[PDB]
Amino acid sequence: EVKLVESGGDFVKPGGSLKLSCAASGFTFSNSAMSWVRQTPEKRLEWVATINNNGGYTHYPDTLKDRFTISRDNVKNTLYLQMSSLRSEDTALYYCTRQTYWYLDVWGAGTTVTVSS
Amino acid sequence: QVQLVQSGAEVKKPGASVKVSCKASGYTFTGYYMHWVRQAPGQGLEWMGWINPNSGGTNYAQKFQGRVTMTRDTSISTAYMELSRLRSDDTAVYYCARGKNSDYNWDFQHWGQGTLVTVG
Amino acid sequence: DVVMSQSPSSLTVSLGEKVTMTCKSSQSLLYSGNQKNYLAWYQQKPGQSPKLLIYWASTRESGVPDRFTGSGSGTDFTLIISSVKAEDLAVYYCQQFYFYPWTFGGGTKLEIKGGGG
Amino acid sequence: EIVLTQSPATLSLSPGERATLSCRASQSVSSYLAWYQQKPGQAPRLLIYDASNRATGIPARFSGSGSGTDFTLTISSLEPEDFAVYYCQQYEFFGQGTKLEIG
C-alpha cells in the first residue's frame, strides 16, 4: 500500500528546465522526510536532494545547489524537484524516496529526464 | 506528567567526587535513555553521556571517559552520575534529561531541576 | 566527499553458492554518540528500482531473509548471501548516509546461473 | 566534532521587534537540529526540533528553518517573556548560545 509515483520526466535541451512530481500514498506523507535520487544511464546512484517533513530544511550536493530545488505539498501529498539550466550530466532516472531517519526505505519506479541536443 | 527530580546542591573540595541522583516518574523508566548535561555558571550546555536503563550500558563524552560513572537503580526509577577528581572548572549545574520520544532521544524535552556543584 | 568502494564489480555464481561482497568507505561511518554505523545496503532487481535491504550496517529490513547478513564497522563493511536463490539476482549498492552529500558505491553485479525466476 | 557556531552571542531588542538567530555547523551531518530556550534560573526547554518543527506549547511566532549547514531561528513580535538564552543542538553537540535580552 506504501507507494511513490514520479512523473514529469521528459526530453529537454541543454539549459532547459523541468519540475518533477511525486505522488505519495499509503502512509502519513507529512511526517517523514523525503529525498530525490537519480540513476545515470551507467547505473550509478547519486543522491540529489533532501527535505524534512515541514519543508523547513533542505540540502543538496554543492554542485546541484544552484540548479535544483526540492519542495513538497503536504495537502496534496506531493513531492517536487525543480530543475533548471539542465546539463548533459543530469540525464538519469530520477527516483522519489521516503526517508526513515536518513536511509531510503521506499523507492518509486522513477521518471526519466534525458538532456541532449 | 513526566517528572525528573534531582538531588540537592553539593559543595566539594578539589580532588573529591560528587554523585548526583535523578528520580524519574510519570513513564516507564526502562523505556527511555537518560542523558546528563552540565552547564557552568554563565556558560553553554555540555553533554556528558547517556545510560540505557534497560540494559545498563553507558556512553560518555571523551572529555569525561574514565572520570564519570553513570548507573541506574530501576527498582526506584533513579539514575546516578558520579564525577571524580573534581577541579574548579567542574563547577556547574548538572541536569538529567530524557528524550522527547524513544525514536530520537537527543531531543531533550524533559529536564531535571538541575543540581549545583561548587568545587573549591 | 566520502568515497564508497564496492568489490567485486560483478560475479556469476550457481544456485546455492556463497556470495561475499565488500563495501569500503574512505571515512569511518560510526558515530560515537549512538554507536551506529550509518551504512545501508540496497538491492536492485532487473527492471526494478532499488529497495532497502539492510540499514545501520547489520539490521535487515522487513521481509529480508536471514540468508542476507550485513556486518562490519567503521570503514570496512560486508554483505553475505549464505546460499543464493534465483530471486537474489540483482545489483547490490552500499550507501553512507552520515556525511552530506550522501554517497553510494559503484554496486556489485550478481548474476546467477539459470536466471532470476 | 560538529562545531555549532551561534551568532550573535548576545542581542538586545524591544518588544514587537524580530530576532534572527543563526546557527552554522562546521560539518554537514545527518541529524535533527534542535533549538532550546533557557529562561533565567530554569532548565532548558525544547523549542524547535528537526530544524523547523515547533515543540509542544511553542507559539507560531517562533520559526526555525535550515539549508545545508546554515540554520536560522526567527522570533517574530518579540515579547518580554522571550528573555532567554537560545541554544542549537545536533546529537551531543551544542552551540555557545545566543543571549537574547528584551526591554
Numbering used by the authors:
A (entry chain A): 1 to 52, 52A, 53 to 82, 82A, 82B, 82C, 83 to 113
B (entry chain H): 1 to 52, 52A, 53 to 82, 82A, 82B, 82C, 83 to 100, 100A, ...
C (entry chain Q): 1 to 27, 27A, 27B, 27C, 27D, 27E, 27F, 28 to 111
D (entry chain L): 1 to 91, 96 to 107
What text appears in the publication on this structure?
VRC01-class antibodies are among the broadest and most potent bNAbs isolated to date. These antibodies share the same Ig heavy chain (IgH) V gene, VH1-2*02, which encodes a CDRH2 (complementary determining region 2, heavy chain) region that makes critical contacts with the CD4 binding site (CD4bs) on Env. In addition, these antibodies express Ig light chains (IgLs) with 5-aa-long CDRL3s (complementary determining region 3, light chain), a rare feature of human IgLs that is nonetheless required to accommodate the CDRH2-restricted mode of binding. To expand bNAb-producing B cells and their precursors and thereby give these cells a competitive advantage, we explored an alternative, non–Env-derived immunogen approach using a monoclonal anti-idiotypic antibody, iv8, that binds VRC01-class precursor B cell receptors (BCRs) with high affinity.
We produced an anti-idiotypic monoclonal antibody against germline VRC01, iv8, using hybridoma technology. In addition to germline VRC01, iv8 binds other germline VRC01-class monoclonal antibodies, including NIH45-46, 3BNC60, 12A21, and VRC-CH31. To determine the molecular basis for iv8 specificity, we solved the crystal structure of iv8 single-chain variable fragment (scFv) in complex with germline VRC01 scFv at 2.4 Å. Indeed, iv8 primarily interacts with the IgL of germline VRC01 (constituting 80% of the total buried surface area [BSA]) including CDRL3 residues (Tyr91, Glu96, and Phe97). Of the remaining germline VRC01 BSA; 60% of the contacts are with CDRH3 (Asp99, Tyr100, and Trp100B) and 40% with the germline-encoded VH1-2*02, including residues Trp47, Trp50, and Asn58 that make critical contacts with Env. Together, the crystal structure and binding data establish the dominant role of the germline VRC01 light chain for recognition by the iv8 paratope. More than 80% of the iv8+ B cells expressed the VK3-11 light chain found in VRC01. This is consistent with the extensive interactions found between iv8 and the glVRC01 light chain in the crystal structure. As might be expected from the structural information, the IgHs were not enriched for VH1-2.
